Design a protein around this ligand. Structure first.
Ligand code: COA
Length: 290
C-alpha cells in the first residue's frame, strides 16, 4: 500500500494505533529527518510538479525531497489517510532582503485538529526555520524547541510565525559574515490565515515560483535536512552543518566549499539524493538562508 511505502520512506513504524499529538509529532519528526527540503529539479532540467501522484513517486519511490507545496502536500495526504483532521493553509513568506512579506500566497502549511485543539504542522519551512514539533495555535505563547523558540502571534485576524534564534558560532573564519547566515536573533518566518485551502489554490504560485524573475528558487540551488541534533543545508556549492545549542546557548555552524565533483557525493551521503540528470548548482544572492 502507498501509505506503508510512505512510512518506510520516512522510517516510521506505525505500531501505535492512536491519532494523538505523540503520533502526529513522531510522523512530522520522521518526515523532516528523511525528506529534504529541495528544489534541485529546477537546476537539472526536471519538473516541479504539483500533482500528488507525481510528488509521491518522486519523494517516496525515487527518494527525493521537495519544496513546501510538495512536502506538505505529501504530509497532508499521509495524515488524512490515517485519519487526522488536516487542513491546508496558505502563507506568505517573509522576505528579509526587503523587510516585507510576499504578495503571493507562496507557502503551503498544515493545521491538524485533535479533539478541538489546533496545531500548526509544517514539514517544509526550510533549513533552520523548521519546526521539530507541531506548534499549538496559541497567540503569545513561547514554544521552545531545540532549533529555537517559536512564537505564533495573531494581529487583525492574521497569524504570524516568528522564531527567536540563539547566537551563532562560525567555525570557518572565511564564512564569519556569509550572506547565508540569518542576521537577527528575532526572525519573522511567515504569515497566514485559517481559511481552508485546496491544492488548486497554489497552482498559480507553483508556476510563479518556477518562472518569475523575483523567485529565489530560479537562481539558487538549495537543499536542507534535519537531524536529531541539527541541520544540514547545501546552498549552491556551500555545504553547512549546524549543531543546535552546542554550548552556552549558542549554535555551532560549519561551512565547506564543495567542488563540482563533491556535490554529487554530498547529495548521496548526506541528503540521500541521487539525480538522474546533470545538476548546475547556483550560489544565490543570500535570499535563501541556512
Ligand atoms: C516569495 C518570492 C517569490 C517573492 O514573492 P513575490 O510574491 O514576487 O514578492 P513581491 O511581489 O512582494 O516582491 C516585492 C519586491 O521585492 C523584490 N524582491 C523580491 N525578492 C527579493 C529578494 N530576494 N531580494 C531583493 N529583492 C527582492 C521584488 O523585485 C519586488 O519588487 P517590486 O516591488 O519592484 O515589484 C521570493 O522572495 C522567494 O523566492 N522567496 C522564497 C520563499 C521561501 O523560502 N519559501 C520556502 C518554502 S517553499
Amino acid at each position: 500500500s502507498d501509505i506503508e511505502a510512505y512510512f518506510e520512506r520516512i522510517g516510521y513504524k506505525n505500531s501505535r494505533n492512536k491519532l494523538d499529538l505523540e503520533t502526529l509529532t513522531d510522523i512530522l519528526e520522521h518526515q523532516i529527518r528523511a525528506v529534504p527540503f529541495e528544489n534541485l529539479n529546477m537546476h537539472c532540467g526536471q519538473a516541479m510538479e504539483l500533482g500528488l501522484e507525481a510528488i509521491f513517486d518522486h519523494i517516496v519511490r525515487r527518494n527525493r525531497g521537495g519544496w513546501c507545496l510538495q512536502v506538505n502536500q505529501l504530509l497532508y495526504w499521509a495524515l488524512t489517510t490515517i485519519g487526522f483532521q488536516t487542513t491546508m493553509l496558505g502563507g506568505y513568506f517573509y522576505i528579509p532582503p526587503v523587510n516585507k512579506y510576499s504578495t503571493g500566497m507562496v507557502h503551503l502549511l498544515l493545521q491538524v485538529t485533535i479533539d478541538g485543539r489546533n496545531y500548526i504542522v509544517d514539514a517544509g519551512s526550510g533549513s533552520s526555520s523548521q519546526m521539530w514539533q507541531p506548534l499549538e495555535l496559541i497567540s503569545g505563547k513561547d514554544q521552545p524547541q531545540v532549533p529555537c523558540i517559536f512564537c505564533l502571534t495573531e494581529e487583525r485576524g492574521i497569524w504570524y510565525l516568528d522564531q527567536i534564534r540563539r547566537e551563532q558560532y562560525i567555525t570557518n573564519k572565511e564564512f564569519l559574515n556569509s550572506h547565508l547566515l540569518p542576521k537577527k536573533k528575532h526572525q519573522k518566518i511567515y504569515l497566514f490565515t485559517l481559511e481552508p485551502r485546496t491544492i488548486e489554490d497554489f497552482e498559480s504560485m507553483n508556476t510563479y515560483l518556477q518562472t518569475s524573475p523575483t523567485s529565489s528558487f530560479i537562481t539558487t540551488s538549495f537543499c536542507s535536512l534535519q537531524t536529531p541534533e541539527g541541520v544540514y543545508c547545501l546552498v549552491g556549492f556551500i555545504l553547512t552543518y549546524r549543531k543546535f545549542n552546542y554550548k552556552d546557548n549558542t549554535d555551532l555552524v560549519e561551512f565547506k566549499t564543495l567542488t563540482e565533483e563533491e556535490v554529487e557525493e554530498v547529495l548521496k551521503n548526506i541528503f540521500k539524493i541521487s539525480l538522474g540528470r546533470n545538476l548546475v548548482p547556483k550560489p544565490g544572492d543570500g535570499s535563501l538562508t541556512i
